[PDB]
RNA sequence: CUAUAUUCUUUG
């Protein structure tokens, strides 16, 4: 981890003042909204598609 | 009278949107009303149709590889489709060059290909062209196909990868598709791989032409016409924009008078100059009207006769042209009855400024012969779409076309060049919505000066008269 | 079943083999077999697929390239860039006119009417639906002077034709003239009148 | 010619050639003005399926069933708007189309063209005028029940 | 010399604007993996998409590695999160492939023979298989230029 | 500063004699002056009336006098 | 004042003398055999453009007082 | 090297052409994508990216009141109830077109009004705040140690006259976190910039001053 | 590359669609494929490029 | 070695070019000419070899007047 | 073909809780039809259509207001990009709008989209983020 | 009074920004010694206004 | 730095 700017991004200094510019708590993919279809034609079955997995889990 | 400047009444409206805009509007207003009739192609089109297959053809060109920057070269002979192509190229922003077909060799074709460097070439297999037998003009059928194979011999050599090779002729590497326009009367269409898809929805989510039309601007040039008498050695084809065309047609349409679905004709072979290419069909579009084509051609006596016989059936309230072809009508007009022409009321001739001065007693001959209420004469250089000033048969005074400034200045300034003394030879400069400062050349798209006062150089020398009158001249050579 | 070469051998080669080195027999080749595509194996239709399939030149950060190809080459580059900037801006203004117009259901007009933009700036929920104006309200005239007609008042001088409400001035100037400066040239650039000129006192 | 071939599907029920659009390969494209009145609907399939009895043992019905389901997934009807589709009955909803490109009128009057005779039986002329999975029909011919 | 090192914590989200690794020209130490690009001259690895960077080691020789970037971050996050939460409840298995200690064993129990499938030299005839396969359409690809297994 | 090249032998922002550098006058300020009652809407407003009513101090006045900007004023 | 007085040249002058306050000689043709020879050479120097009757200097000051606008809205 | 491929042909909306034949002996855009000799094109180079447009700035010459800042004031346990937000804004445009409007309440584009008076009678505000000679509200934003050009700022509230401490004690509820001092002439609020000046001016306008 | 915020800006770049970039074996002896033979094929020179690069094809 | 490739169409535009050792060799007395993108024309043009330091628009860059077959 | 009928027809879901705007009788009828139906359809087939003039005349004949499809966002962002001066995107300050100091050694930071405001953002910790909203609904960068 | 603002800076830099943050910006010289045979990218890394290093800016 | 390069590109 040696080097000057590596020291500058730990103590977060002038260029790096807000470090990692990509952190957890951003996802470029789902934009933090829940993908589900509540748009079911009949309002009866509204939750019919639920827990359709997003990945292997 | 005193100083050389001329101005039209500025009270008439100007149309500044794209062409596609007015096509859509006119489509929504009069959908079923007629737009253009052509008997010999069996073409009867409403505004519905002009819109529908304009943008349909546009998508066709998109799928044939055309993109907003590039150019299209068109050798077509007085068809419906050269105009449809104008609208199509307008929609995708491609410059459409229309070149005169009457004298065409492999040589000047290769010249055009070197100049415009077009992506598409719209040509025929067989094209009809005038030529002289025993001192008499007759139609010949030229094989243009042969010509294309002369210019590009490499299409004759076929190895079975070659449809997909990246560059089809190492000579012209920009040439991609050649669209052949010819009527084949067999009921079965062509197979889907020699044909472009012109119909139905082209997408799912949004029609991409209207995404694209946001990036297009009314002054983006789309057209190029050959100038028979080039102002300089340099200016070869003069170039028009959306604004130029639409406003030319609207000014003509307004200045005459035109009412919805009144019938209004055009003499052929004018689609290469701003009569059939610009003024006529955009007049018919801007004011609800119905354009009518007579017989496909002019030069031979037989289809002059055929022409008149057609024009009396089609009920034309008035028609357009140039003197040269009105001679042909004049010859064979005597052979018919005085009352066959009773629907014809007015007629119009457009005049290049290098003609000079169509004689008025000739107009008198026209009106007395066809039982014409009135003859209108329009005049101007080619960058004006042949309209700067205009006169009637009853009014010999030359009035300026509305929104046009013509001034003749000295040589020592650009914006601030001073007006001259009204008889003096000097530099002619025009200002108006349908005037164009663009021109096309071996180099590319070029422009000459458009200054801070708003005028634009034509690089032409001119003389103004005391009464409203312009006379063009070549560069002064002392 | 299987073959030693894994595909049926075409009769030409066979007959050419068992009559040694001679093919006079079948020289007319049958066309290759077809590969069918499953149209429902294809992925669902996407919007971005529709945006970018055309591959327009406007998504470049270098500048507006579609603008450069639609523009005269005559113009010296440094003055040409800010020309292309002017048309690309005018296209923006027009765009926003179409947007605010469709927003208020008004038939389009451009420079823009004021009341439209200012009173549509007054609603956060008005971005949901847009309506077309009736086919009657539709006209060819997109300039206000031709649309709103005459109103009672004026300010600028009566004598000047350049000030007339309906007067038409070209939207942008075009000069063939070259630019006077570039960073790689040493003495290049414009000088104050009483500054020493270039190569002065040689 | 495996790498160069024009796309050919075995079922155009989605009318894919209208949406997925490949450039005509040929250097010379033939385009008239006469074809603007031509209507481009996909070539008639073999084994017209609208007549298939939906027996649970039949091969063609099974294969058409699963086709339709895959289409219904690709246009995002099935999991989304209609989470459970039990496909039993073979449904054909047809419209009385003339294959008319745009909306027309009468020459003798200027009236709207009179409502067409309601279709009695299904024909080959009637095929693309029905509702298959995802296909396209001109608005002009959807104008009546 | 200069020291050439990671400009991001490995196993951490990263934006396309940052250099991932700077290598030094000796085949490089780190080769571009999924969603990563490498400068032809500088051999400096940049990220294409915005995602979570991880180091994959070649099964064959552990001293040759790939940098990978996982496009969606939240997957990796709630995965590692649940994993840790379980680690502390003793409810997690150590038999997963994330564990450096066990990866060899894991590759061995899945595909036991992968050594000899690597050592295998195809003769010229099955490297170069006769073109008419590709022409008649029995096979849809002709690729003589991969004789080598990178795994 | 010797690692940095010269640009434009005058210099980047450079004054020369007869460069037009206007001191900005925000329409906001002017309108505010009118509604507050410094100035007459009735009488044609010159630079003189602006100076007398004190809406601009002397230190702001220099040749050429002033530019009229619209800042945050939509009508 | 521009649109009325300034933009019009002197009623006497032709193309070449247009910019002068009053025409400096009678005839508009180049006056001296030297001036004429110069003009001929100028017209064949530039290829033959319309305005070339009037001599323009080959060199420029590059001074900010004589410069006009490069491009922009009109 | 024979240069060819099916990539020369346009394909719209999905590519159904065989994928082995796209580029033949020509570098794909995927090959130049992985091989680029520059690195990391800047975040400003994303053109499609949807950028924010600032609202109209609150200046000393232009009072543009934002309903939500005012909502930031209304959530607070202040005493001395505030006029509702509608009243701090001048009369409308098409309402003020003709001559039928009064002189004091005239329409202003800038937006300007003479003080409204207290939002409630039967109550006495402990302090009184004087407007400027131009009618500007009191707080000025300075910089502590400007010779260094230090980004750290404070707010000096001067024309306050009355019991200044009650003023301070409402000022406590507006800026709970910041540091506050009183002096006979003026009140200091530290670590508060132009934002703070905007709140303050909203509170004073809405207070009837 | 010059973005739009630089001091200078160039014209439109060459359209990708024409005059393509051939994929050519690296001429550098270190970067050249081992088995690559120096291309001696004794051949009557064919001048036009069209037929010339059909030579590099096996389509039969 | 360093030479200049100046557009055969005279835009005055040139590009620095370092001759390969074959062209560094005097084995041929011909000027190298190469197709390039010309920025000024936005087109593909032919470029010729020329000495680097010298005016790139000479009086000698003038082409003789050519009458074009097109039009009247 | 009535008005109220159209309003109900456009918002239709299959089994509704309540239904309004329609006359009572029709509501009762619909309630019956829905009670008889299962949530699950036994055949599904679907077609696609594109706009034409007959649409217009459907809204105009009945005196309704024909809906319009909204212009595209990405085109708006593209135009707004190419519109702005080249100096809009240059570096205008010591500090990125985030508050980080940008030293000039690094080319990623040589351009700046949003103007940096050094006197704004001090109040955000005491306020709701609703305050951060721009004119177009996008949060503007504040110094923190 | 102005003794210390000397023009060697005023030829080189230009100072830019909102009060309390002001960069001084200059172009980079790699330029007029060797342009040729390098690469286009690093060649036009020249043409951007960049801020100078903060030490130098404080110094001036 | 001074000269030679004067359209986007170029020397010592």
């Amino acid at each position: 981890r040696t080097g000057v700017e590596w020291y500058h991004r730990l103590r977060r200094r002038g260029a790096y003042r807000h470090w990692p510019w990509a952190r957890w708590n951003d996802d470029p993919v789902r934009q933090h909204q829940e993908l589900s279809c509540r748009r079911t034609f009949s309002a009866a079955v509204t939750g019919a598609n639920e827990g359709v997995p997003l990945w292997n889990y | 009278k005193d100083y050389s400047v001329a101005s039209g009444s500025v009270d008439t409206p100007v149309l500044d949107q794209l062409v596609g805009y007015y096509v859509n509007i006119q489509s929504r207003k009069m959908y079923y009303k007629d737009f253009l009739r052509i008997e010999h192609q069996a073409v009867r089109w409403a505004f519905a149709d002009i819109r529908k297959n304009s943008e349909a053809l546009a998508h066709g060109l998109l799928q044939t590889g055309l993109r907003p920057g590039q150019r299209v070269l068109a050798i077509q002979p007085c068809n419906c489709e050269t105009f449809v192509l104008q609208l199509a190229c307008a929609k995708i922003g491609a410059l459409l060059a229309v070149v005169p077909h009457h004298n065409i060799s492999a040589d000047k074709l290769r010249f055009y290909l070197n100049e415009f460097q077009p992506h598409h070439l719209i040509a025929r297999e067989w094209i009809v062209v005038p030529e002289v037998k025993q001192g008499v003009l007759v139609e010949r059928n030229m094989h243009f196909w042969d010509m294309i194979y002369n210019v590009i011999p490499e299409l004759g050599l076929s190895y079975p990868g070659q449809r997909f090779q990246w560059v089809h002729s190492q000579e012209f590497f920009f040439l991609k598709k050649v669209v052949i326009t010819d009527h084949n009367m067999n009921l079965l269409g062509v197979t889907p791989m020699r044909k472009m898809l012109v119909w139905g929805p082209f997408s799912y989510y949004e029609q991409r032409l209207r995404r694209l039309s946001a990036l297009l601007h009314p002054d983006d040039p789309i057209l190029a016409l050959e100038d028979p008498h080039p102002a300089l050695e340099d200016k070869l084809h003069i170039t028009y924009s959306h604004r130029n065309c639409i406003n030319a047609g609207f000014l003509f349409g307004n200045l005459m008078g035109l009412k919805a679905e009144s019938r209004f004709g055009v003499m052929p072979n004018h689609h290469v100059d701003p009569v059939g290419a610009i003024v006529a069909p955009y007049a018919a579009l801007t004011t609800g009207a119905v354009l009518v084509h007579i017989h496909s051609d002019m030069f031979t006596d037989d289809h002059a006769i055929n022409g008149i016989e057609k024009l009396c059936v089609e009920e034309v309230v008035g028609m357009l042209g140039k003197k040269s072809d009105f001679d042909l009508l004049l010859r064979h007009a005597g052979n018919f009855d005085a009352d066959q022409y009773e629907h014809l009321k007015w007629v119009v001739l457009f005049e290049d400024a290098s003609e000079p001065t169509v004689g008025d007693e000739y107009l008198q001959k026209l009106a007395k012969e066809l039982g014409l209420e009135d003859v209108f004469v329009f005049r101007g250089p080619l960058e004006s779409a042949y309209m700067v000033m205009w006169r009637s048969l009853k009014r010999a005074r030359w009035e300026m076309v509305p929104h046009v400034e013509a001034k003749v200045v000295g040589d020592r300034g650009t914006a601030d060049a001073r007006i001259l003394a009204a008889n003096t030879r000097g530099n002619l400069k025009l200002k108006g919505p349908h005037i164009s400062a663009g021109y096309y050349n071996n180099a590319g798209l070029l422009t000459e000066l458009v200054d801070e006062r708003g005028f634009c150089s034509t690089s032409r020398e001119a003389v103004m008269d005391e009464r409203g009158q312009l006379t063009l001249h070549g560069t002064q050579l002392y | 079943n299987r073959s030693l070469l894994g595909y049926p051998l075409r009769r030409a080669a066979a007959m050419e083999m068992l009559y040694g080195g001679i093919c006079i027999q079948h020289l007319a080749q049958p066309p290759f077999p077809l590969r069918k595509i499953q149209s429902e194996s294809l992925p669902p239709p996407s919007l971005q697929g529709e945006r970018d399939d055309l591959e327009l030149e406007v998504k470049d950060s270098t500048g507006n390239v579609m603008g450069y190809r639609l523009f005269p080459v005559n113009i010296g580059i440094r003055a040409r860039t800010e020309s292309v900037r002017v048309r690309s801006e005018d296209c923006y203004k027009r765009f926003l006119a179409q947007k605010h117009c469709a927003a208020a259901g008004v038939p389009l007009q451009f420079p823009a009417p004021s009341s439209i933009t200012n009173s549509n700036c007054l609603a956060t929920p008005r971005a949901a639906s847009h309506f077309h104006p009736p086919s009657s309200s539709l006209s060819l005239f997109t300039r206000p002077a031709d649309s709103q007609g005459g109103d009672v008042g004026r300010t600028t001088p009566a004598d000047v034709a350049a000030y007339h409400p309906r007067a038409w001035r070209p939207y942008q100037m075009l000069k063939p003239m070259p630019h006077n400066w570039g960073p790689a040239v040493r003495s290049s650039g414009v000088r104050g009148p009483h500054m020493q000129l270039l190569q002065e006192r040689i | 010619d495996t790498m160069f071939q024009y796309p050919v599907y075995e079922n155009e029920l989605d009318t894919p050639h209208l949406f997925n659009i490949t450039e005509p390969p040929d250097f010379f494209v033939y385009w008239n003005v006469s074809d603007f009145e031509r209507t481009s609907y996909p070539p008639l399939p073999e084994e017209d399926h609208r007549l298939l009895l939906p027996l649970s043992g039949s091969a063609p019905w099974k294969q058409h069933r699963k086709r339709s389901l895959k289409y219904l997934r690709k246009h995002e009807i099935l999991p989304n708007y209609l989470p459970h589709v039990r496909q039993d009955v073979n449904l054909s909803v047809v419209f009385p189309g003339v294959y008319a490109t745009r909306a027309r009128l009468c020459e003798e009057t200027g009236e709207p063209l009179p409502p067409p005779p309601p279709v009695s039986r299904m024909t080959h002329r009637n095929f693309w005028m029905t509702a298959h999975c995802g296909n396209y029909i001109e608005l002009a011919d959807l104008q009546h029940p | 010399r200069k020291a050439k090192l990671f400009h991001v914590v490995p196993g951490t989200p990263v934006t396309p604007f940052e250099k991932l690794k700077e290598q030094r020209r000796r085949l490089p130490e780190y080769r571009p993996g999924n969603n990563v690009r490498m400068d032809p001259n500088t051999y400096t690895l940049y990220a294409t998409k915005k995602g979570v960077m991880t180091i994959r080691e070649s099964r064959i020789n552990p001293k040759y590695k790939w940098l990978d970037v996982e496009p969606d971050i939240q997957k990796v996050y709630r995965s590692r999160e649940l994993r840790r939460a379980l680690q502390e409840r003793e409810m997690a298995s150590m038999a997963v492939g994330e564990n450096s200690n066990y990866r060899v064993e894991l590759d061995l129990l899945l595909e036991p023979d992968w050594r000899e499938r690597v050592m295998h030299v195809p003769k010229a005839t099955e490297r170069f298989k006769d073109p008419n396969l590709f022409t008649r359409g029995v096979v849809n690809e002709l690729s003589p230029l991969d004789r080598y297994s990178y795994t | 500063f010797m690692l940095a090249p010269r640009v434009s032998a005058g210099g980047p922002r450079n004054r020369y004699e007869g460069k037009l550098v206007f001191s900005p006058l925000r329409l906001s300020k002017l309108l505010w002056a009118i509604d507050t009652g410094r100035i007459n809407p009735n009488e044609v407003i010159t630079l003189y009336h602006l100076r007398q009513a004190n809406v601009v101090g002397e230190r702001e006045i220099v040749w050429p006098g002033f530019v009229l900007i619209s800042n945050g004023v939509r009508r | 004042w521009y649109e009325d007085s300034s933009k019009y040249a002197h009623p006497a002058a032709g193309r070449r003398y247009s910019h002068y306050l009053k025409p400096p000689t009678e005839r508009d043709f180049p006056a001296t055999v030297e001036e004429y020879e110069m003009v001929k050479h100028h017209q064949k120097w530039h290829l033959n453009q319309p305005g070339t009757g009037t001599l323009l200097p080959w060199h420029s000051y590059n001074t900010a007082d004589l410069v006009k606008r490069a491009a922009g809205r009109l | 090297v024979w240069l060819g491929g099916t990539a020369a042909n346009t394909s719209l909306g999905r590519d159904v052409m065989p994928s082995t034949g796209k580029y033949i002996n020509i570098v794909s855009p995927t090959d130049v994508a992985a091989n680029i000799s520059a690195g990391a094109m800047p975040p400003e180079a994303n053109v499609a990216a949807a950028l924010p447009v600032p609202r109209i700035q609150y200046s000393k010459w232009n009072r543009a009141l934002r309903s939500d800042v005012y909502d930031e004031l209304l959530k607070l346990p202040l005493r001395y109830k505030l006029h509702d937000f509608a009243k701090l804004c001048p009369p409308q445009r098409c309402q003020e077109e003709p001559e039928a409007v009064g002189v004091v309440g005239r329409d202003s584009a800038v937006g300007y009004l003479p003080p409204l008076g207290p939002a409630d009678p039967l109550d006495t505000i402990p302090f009184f705040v004087h407007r400027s000679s131009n009618g500007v509200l009191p707080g000025k934003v300075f910089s502590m140690h400007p010779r260094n050009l230090m980004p750290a700022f404070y707010l000096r509230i001067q024309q306050v006259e009355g019991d200044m401490f009650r003023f301070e004690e409402e000022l406590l509820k507006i800026f709970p976190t910041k540091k506050i001092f009183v002096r006979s002439h003026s009140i200091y609020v530290y670590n508060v910039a132009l934002d703070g000046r905007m709140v303050l001016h909203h509170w004073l306008l809405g207070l009837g001053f | 590359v010059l973005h739009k915020w630089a001091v200078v800006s160039r014209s439109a770049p060459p359209p990708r669609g024409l005059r393509p970039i051939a994929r050519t074996i690296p001429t550098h002896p270190r970067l050249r494929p081992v088995d690559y033979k120096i291309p001696y094929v004794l051949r009557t020179f064919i001048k036009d490029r069209h037929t010339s690069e059909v030579q590099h094809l096996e389509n039969r | 070695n360093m030479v200049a490739l100046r557009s055969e169409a005279n835009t005055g535009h040139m590009e620095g070019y370092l001759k390969t050792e074959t062209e560094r060799l005097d084995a041929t007395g011909r000027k190298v000419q190469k197709v390039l993108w010309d920025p000024v024309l936005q087109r593909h043009c032919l470029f010729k070899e020329t000495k680097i330091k010298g005016p790139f628009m000479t009086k000698s860059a003038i082409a003789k007047k050519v009458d074009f077959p097109i039009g009247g | 073909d009535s008005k109220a009928s159209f309003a109900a027809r456009a918002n239709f879901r299959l089994h509704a809780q309540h239904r309004d705007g329609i006359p009572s009788s029709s509501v009762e009828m619909l309630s019956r039809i829905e009670q008889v139906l299962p949530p699950d359809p036994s055949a599904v087939t679907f077609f696609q259509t594109k706009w034409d003039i007959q649409v217009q005349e459907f809204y105009e004949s009945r005196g309704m207001l024909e809906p319009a499809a909204p212009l595209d966002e990405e085109i708006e962002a593209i135009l707004a990009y190419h519109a702005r001066k080249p100096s809009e995107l240059r570096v205008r300050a010591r500090h990125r709008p985030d508050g980080s100091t940008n030293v000039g050694d690094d080319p990623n930071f040589w351009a700046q989209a949003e103007p940096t405001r050094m006197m704004d953002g001090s109040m955000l910790s005491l306020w709701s983020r609703r305050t951060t909203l721009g004119a177009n609904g996008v949060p503007i960068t504040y110094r923190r | 009074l102005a003794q210390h603002r000397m023009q060697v800076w005023q030829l080189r830099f230009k100072e830019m920004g909102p009060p309390f943050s002001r960069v001084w910006v200059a172009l980079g010289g790699k330029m007029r010694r060797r342009r040729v045979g390098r690469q286009v990218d690093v060649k036009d890394m020249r043409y951007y206004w960049r801020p100078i290093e903060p030490q130098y800016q404080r110094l001036y």
Side-chain angles (χ1 to χ4, degrees), chain C residues 61-62 69 77-78 80-81 183, chain I residues 2-4 7 9 11-13 15:
Chain C
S61 68
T62 67
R69 271 161 199 180
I77 183 61
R78 291 207 44 99
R80 194 168 120 181
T81 298
Chain I
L2 289 175
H3 306 286
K4 75 162 293 187
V7 148
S9 45
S11 297

Side-chain angles (χ1 to χ4, degrees), chain B residues 32 45-46 48-49 53 63 81 145 176-183 187 193-195 198-199 201 203, chain D residues 4 6 18-19 21-33 36 38-40 102-103 105 136 138:
Chain B
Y32 306 98
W45 277 6
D49 294 317
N53 42 67
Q63 84 145 298
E81 41 247 310
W145 199 248
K176 276 302 164 60
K177 291 305 188 64
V178 174
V179 173
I180 304 311
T181 304
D182 267 341
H183 185 66
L187 78 177
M193 60 180 48
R194 42 203 68 270
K195 128 225 291 177
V198 241
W199 172 90
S203 94
Chain D
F4 313 132
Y6 184 90
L18 284 194
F19 301 104
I21 306 169
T22 54
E23 178 170 330
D26 204 17
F27 183 83
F28 292 90
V29 271
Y30 297 84
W31 166 86
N32 218 171
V33 82
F36 287 146
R38 279 300 167 79
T39 302
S40 177
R102 43 145 236 194
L105 288 190
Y136 167 80
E138 261 155 352

Side-chain angles (χ1 to χ4, degrees), chain K residues 7 17 20 46 52 65 71 78 82 84 102 107 111 117 122 131 140 144:
Chain K
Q17 293 301 323
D20 314 278
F46 74 109
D52 188 13
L65 233 29
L71 276 154
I78 283 182
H82 287 301
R84 61 178 67 215
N102 64 337
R117 283 161 304 131
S122 65
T131 301
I140 68 192
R144 273 205 213 103

Side-chain angles (χ1 to χ4, degrees), chain B residues 88-129:
Chain B
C89 297
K91 255 188 195 66
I92 69 176
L95 185 52
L96 168 70
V98 177
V99 286
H101 59 64
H102 289 283
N103 318 292
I104 187 67
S105 74
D107 212 273
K108 42 179 50 183
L109 171 61
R110 120 172 26 251
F111 185 95
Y112 292 142
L113 290 190
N114 180 41
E115 172 191 33
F116 290 104
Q117 294 184 352
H119 184 279
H120 282 247
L121 161 57
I122 326 294
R124 328 249 310 181
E125 283 180 356
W126 294 98
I127 190 183
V128 180
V129 155

Side-chain angles (χ1 to χ4, degrees), chain B residues 14 22 29 68 113 117 124 151 165-166 188 213 224 269 274 291 296 303 363 374 377 393 398 414 421 429 474:
Chain B
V14 181
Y22 302 117
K29 294 183 84 58
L113 290 190
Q117 294 184 352
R124 328 249 310 181
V151 180
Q165 115 221 66
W166 197 277
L188 275 181
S213 74
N269 301 287
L291 197 101
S296 79
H303 50 228
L363 307 184
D374 202 31
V377 176
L393 177 57
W398 291 85
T414 70
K429 293 171 72 172

Side-chain angles (χ1 to χ4, degrees), chain G:
Chain G
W1 170 77
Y2 189 78
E3 285 301 309
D4 291 354
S5 316
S6 188
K7 76 173 175 181
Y8 299 92
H10 188 132
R15 46 168 33 227
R16 272 173 76 273
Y17 289 150
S18 168
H19 53 295
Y20 291 106
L21 215 49
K22 179 266 297 190
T25 71
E26 195 297 300
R27 192 162 46 105
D28 201 15
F29 206 81
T32 298
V33 61
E34 189 165 36
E35 185 184 3
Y36 174 71
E37 177 198 15
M38 202 154 303
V39 165
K40 272 195 306 201
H41 168 267
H42 197 79
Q43 267 197 10
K44 76 174 177 175
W45 172 268
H46 305 103
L47 323 163
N48 304 160
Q49 303 190 50
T52 49
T54 295
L55 303 172
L56 287 174
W58 23 67
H59 285 139
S60 45
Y61 302 78
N62 308 116
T63 46
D65 58 333
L66 301 166
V67 67
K68 320 169 64 185
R69 294 178 60 188
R73 278 270 229 283
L74 205 44

Side-chain angles (χ1 to χ4, degrees), chain H residues 143-159:
Chain H
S143 158
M144 42 192 133
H145 207 124
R147 191 202 162 181
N148 276 329
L149 286 179
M150 229 177 59
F153 300 129
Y154 68 102
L155 184 56
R156 185 173 192 178
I157 311 179
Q158 282 219 353
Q159 299 305 266

Side-chain angles (χ1 to χ4, degrees), chain B residues 397-421:
Chain B
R397 276 194 190 177
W398 291 85
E399 297 118 9
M400 300 293 288
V401 168
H403 290 299
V404 167
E405 265 68 37
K407 64 179 206 173
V408 176
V409 298
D411 310 291
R412 179 52 200 293
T414 70
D416 30 325
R418 287 170 172 57
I419 308 269
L420 264 27

